[PDB]
A paper describes a structure:
Previously reported X-ray structures of HIV-1(M) CA hexamers showed two distinct conformations with respect to a channel at the 6-fold symmetry axis. The beta hairpin structure (BHP) above the channel can assume ‘open’ (His12 forms a salt bridge with Asp51) or ‘closed positions’ (with a bridging water molecule between His12 and Asp51).
In HIV-1(M), residue Q50 contributes to the tetrahedral hydrogen bonding network that promotes the ‘closed’ BHP position. This arrangement is also conserved in our parental SIVcpzPtt capsid structure, with SIVcpzPtt Q50 contributing to the ‘closed’ BHP position by coordinating a water molecule. This revealed a patch of differences around CA position 120, identifying a deletion of arginine CA 120 in HIV-1(M) and its SIVcpzPtt parent. Inspection of hexamer structures from non-pandemic viruses revealed that the Arg lost from SIVcpzPtt/HIV-1(M) forms a salt bridge between helix 6 and the CypA binding loop in HIV-1(O) and HIV-2 CA helix 6 (Arg 120-Glu 98 in HIV-1(O), Arg 118-Glu 96 in HIV-2). This salt bridge is also conserved in the SIVmac hexamer (Arg 117-Glu 95), but not in the SIVcpzPtt structure. Thus, an HIV-1(M) CA mutant bearing Q50Y + R120, representing non-pandemic HIV lineages, behaved like HIV-1(O) and HIV-2, activating innate immune gene expression in a TRIM5-, cGAS- and TREX1-sensitive way. These observations outline how key amino acid adaptations in the HIV-1(M) parent SIVcpzPtt led to structural changes in the capsid that reduce activation of, and restriction by, key lentiviral sensors, cGAS and TRIM5.
Author numbering:
A (entry chain A), C (entry chain A), F (entry chain A): 1 to 86, 92 to 220
B (entry chain B), D (entry chain B), E (entry chain B): 1 to 85, 95 to 219
Amino acid sequence: PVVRNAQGQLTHNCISPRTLNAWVKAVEEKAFNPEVIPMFMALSCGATPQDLNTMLNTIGGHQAAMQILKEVINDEAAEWDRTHPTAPGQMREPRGSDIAGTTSSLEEQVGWMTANPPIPVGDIYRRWIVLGLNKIVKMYSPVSILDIKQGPKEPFRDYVDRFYKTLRAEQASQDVKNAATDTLLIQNANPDCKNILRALGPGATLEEMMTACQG
Amino acid sequence: PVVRNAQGQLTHNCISPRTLNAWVKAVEEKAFNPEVIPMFMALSCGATPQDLNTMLNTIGGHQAAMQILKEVINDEAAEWDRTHPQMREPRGSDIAGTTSSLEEQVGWMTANPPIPVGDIYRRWIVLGLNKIVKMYSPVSILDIKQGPKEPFRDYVDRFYKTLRAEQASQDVKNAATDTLLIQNANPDCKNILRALGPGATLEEMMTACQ
Amino acid sequence: PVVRNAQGQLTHNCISPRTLNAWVKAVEEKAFNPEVIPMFMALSCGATPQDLNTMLNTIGGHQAAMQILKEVINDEAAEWDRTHPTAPGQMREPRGSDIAGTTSSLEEQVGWMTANPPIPVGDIYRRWIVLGLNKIVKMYSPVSILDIKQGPKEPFRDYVDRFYKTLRAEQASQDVKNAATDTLLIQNANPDCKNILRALGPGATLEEMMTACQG
Amino acid sequence: PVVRNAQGQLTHNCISPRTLNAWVKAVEEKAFNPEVIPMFMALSCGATPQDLNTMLNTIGGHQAAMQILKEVINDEAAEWDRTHPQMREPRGSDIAGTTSSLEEQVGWMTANPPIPVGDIYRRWIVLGLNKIVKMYSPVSILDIKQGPKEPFRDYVDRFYKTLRAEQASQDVKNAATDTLLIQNANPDCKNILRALGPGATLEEMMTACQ
Amino acid sequence: PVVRNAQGQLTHNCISPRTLNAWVKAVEEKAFNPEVIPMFMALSCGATPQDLNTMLNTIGGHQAAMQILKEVINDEAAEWDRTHPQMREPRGSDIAGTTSSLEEQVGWMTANPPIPVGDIYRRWIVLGLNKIVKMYSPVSILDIKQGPKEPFRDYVDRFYKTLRAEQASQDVKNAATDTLLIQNANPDCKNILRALGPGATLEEMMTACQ
Amino acid sequence: PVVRNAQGQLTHNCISPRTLNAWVKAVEEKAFNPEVIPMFMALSCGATPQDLNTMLNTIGGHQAAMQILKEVINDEAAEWDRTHPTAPGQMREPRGSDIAGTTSSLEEQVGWMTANPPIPVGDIYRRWIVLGLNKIVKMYSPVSILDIKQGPKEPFRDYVDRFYKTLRAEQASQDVKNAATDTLLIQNANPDCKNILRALGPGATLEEMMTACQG
């Protein structure tokens, strides 16, 4: 990664074993549940493209997903080159493949990230990777929201947990609550809780619905 | 987070893997037991709004609770905007890190004078966590009754653990909760506690039923 | 905590996850055995009142003990206010509730701890907490020294271990050896070892008693 | 390794116990799966030849592979000496850290201009690791065939894992491997994949057989 | 402990959680095996008396041993006071950290010239630990005899482990312990060891009975 | 150990608990397999003689090996004194027992290691220790290369692994491949693989032999 030392200047540091092992274990434990994306963003903080490739390449399984991620990176790369056609001791401009760390050296990557003004090739590449991870998370979501239905003896809290977890994966995003998803939550509740939720009438908050079906 | 380096100057650092893993494991182990709030406050020390969103977003389960937390944040956001018509002034959505950049967040937190958007957002999150802790509290204090063979210490432990979760708070001891602790004790210990008379300390009650 | 940076000046640092997890695990493993107090003193080194409250508040069980600790803190607080009745840019004097971190901000706590001269509100509060932990350790000591008696086939070393562990908890303190506890150690030994210990005569050291009952 | 301290100057540090243990555990867990190469490149960042030899020498098993690695290093060493007749110039055996001191290695790596003997040696080691990864690849891509009840995603996972090991490389997707992926699919999924027509993306194939 | 920061100046730091946990775990795992003394010396490096008391006080079991240790410390304290009638001079109880403040301890350890009260107290503690190690040594060297089917290496391991604990020390090899090692060997290996003749090295004895 | 601080000057640091625990665990796991030597060299980097004695003394078992190591150290010590017979504020010259940290203080050891010019007593002692560890590794090698023979159903890769692991321990060294060890590898292969290896003819590489017996 690129960080400020105690002298306050930008400098390259080797990716830490702790950071790398945390990412490898995140992928092993969480697969492509939607929470893997925020973990990726946190652990890749300050990353060079070289660091980002290290993080993706150290993954041993999920090679179908890693090939889907490469298609997305190549698409984002081509789009960058399309919208960016092309002084002594200054950097050549970065191509798509330079941002993805394929055709760029570490020295060039750090050069761009510490140039005046900076070209944050690390942050641009991280954005492309997250677009690919979002796509994988939606593809791998195992159950449609249409089939998330409260079991006849499933507590309402456990049903609401499954419901909002499914919406988060299908949208690769937690901005999923609104008047219409409230209606779907009620539609897919079991007969007992459904009858109770309808009697609350319109505009019932999640707190009030969860309280009303708790007994 | 924003911290003082060894040169003593305020600067942004990446959230540490250790800190992130500690929070994720706290939530996995402790669910929404009341002690998760002090753990949240400790592990979010010096946090930017961006760091606070990282900590909440890395939680994979409890998505019902995460939506309750968002409603509370949005309420606190609207209230901030209502009471507040080099840096542009922050809106509610800037404090919650939705419409603000890292650069803006660090700008505000290191401005003269500082606008601690990190500490303001942490306050809103704790309000939401308190609400979740009370919602998830499984047992009313009314149902905490000493078993016929339960040591008094084990009953007092269950009693004050229940008050803490029901009130998302440990300022639960007073003359009336003392009365309820006595009321719900088993006949043997209840008879002993009454004979102490009024105003008995917790030490004296726990000594007398030991 | 408050520490000296490499420039040698006093500054606040966030409590470390390692420190917090060590305290939480100390309490989970050691309950209120007397060794929890020295662990508390070591892990709370440089602590602000805010840090000390973090350490106590992160404990999930033992809420009977945590309420006993609060009674003791409130007593120490009232006593401070009793014995301390009440320039531009200097600190207001601390009340009991400011030392316990209830009515004081972090900024005020660090202010006091780095004032000329310093008011060590962290060290004053730690003292109050240790008085509360001492009281809990004595209350929770499960066996009176009167009932620590060598089993008929218990090795003498194991009996002496139980004896001095009990004295440490009942006094919340390891200054427990003297001519009279030597006499009690002999009184409560099994008939075989008791007969051997009496024949040593007066003034026998612990080494000599432990050697004499080893066979 | 040779790194910049907080004063921003290049200096030698002892290899860290954490780094060494991470590499030893990577080799124990992952054997010569292709992902061991990127782990090697990450954990050897800033390495001197001395550090690289430490990392290879601390491996206790796989001594057949360690001798294959040495043959490759000796080949790269001879090739360097062939193409290269304050610091004396480095020989192949100086880059591999056999005939060079730490002082010489750090000298070269911090010279104006620098001779990155660490990065040159790491390149030779990766060439050797690639060779081992292909030798140890247990299954030909020709034998990766979708089971009659195997989900397509699990078959695609096995297919691209096999190409990666057979080629010690993840640049394995192209029009002809797409054709082989279809050829080796089960009858049901094969019939679906053919009806998509030519040029179907991996996303579209994986969606269609889901 | 008192250490040099990166500015190269002597300053007090809080004992680290890692160091404390390492010592507590050393005592839990190794009891009073002789190797606990070198572990104590390593983990107490730069310790103030306050730090040394923290390390001893955090031990929860072995309270018989902890009282033996205190008798030895009090003996060394009295002896110091006997031979020693800006900083006031330290008494025995000041070196053991009973009657001295942290400020005084750091004062002495950073005085010109320094009075290393930390190193003096560590010496007294090691004297006490040596005494405990010998008391707890479970087997006399006289009872270490090679089994009829015990490999010689396993017998030599038990022999030198026993001498180390009996003497709280690894300077145990000499012409007379060589003679005892031979005397207590099994008949087969004893006959072989005698035929080597006098002055045989440990290498040659271990080779001959292999 | 002795290291450069961020001011770039040589200074003593306490041995780290992590470093010590890594060495103790290396010895517990790897015994005296030949890879323990490179682990010893890595973990003892920058060590004073005092640090090196800490590392050896913290080992609880293997006391036969620790006495063999002491014989070798004493031999290297005597040899140093033989080949080194003997200004204000400069260091006395080191004896063998000063390099081994027996008759030298930490202050003297750091003095020598930071003298102009330096006497690297740490690196000299580490060399003596490695000579002792090499000797132990050869002594403890459990099987002669003469008895490493491919099992009738042992895969060739597993046989070659055992073969080169044995040569490494018997030479305490991995410079073990050459035309004659190639001949011994063939001699000791099972009849099936032996017949295949002979038909390759002379000069066959290890890659070609391992490929030819893989089926």
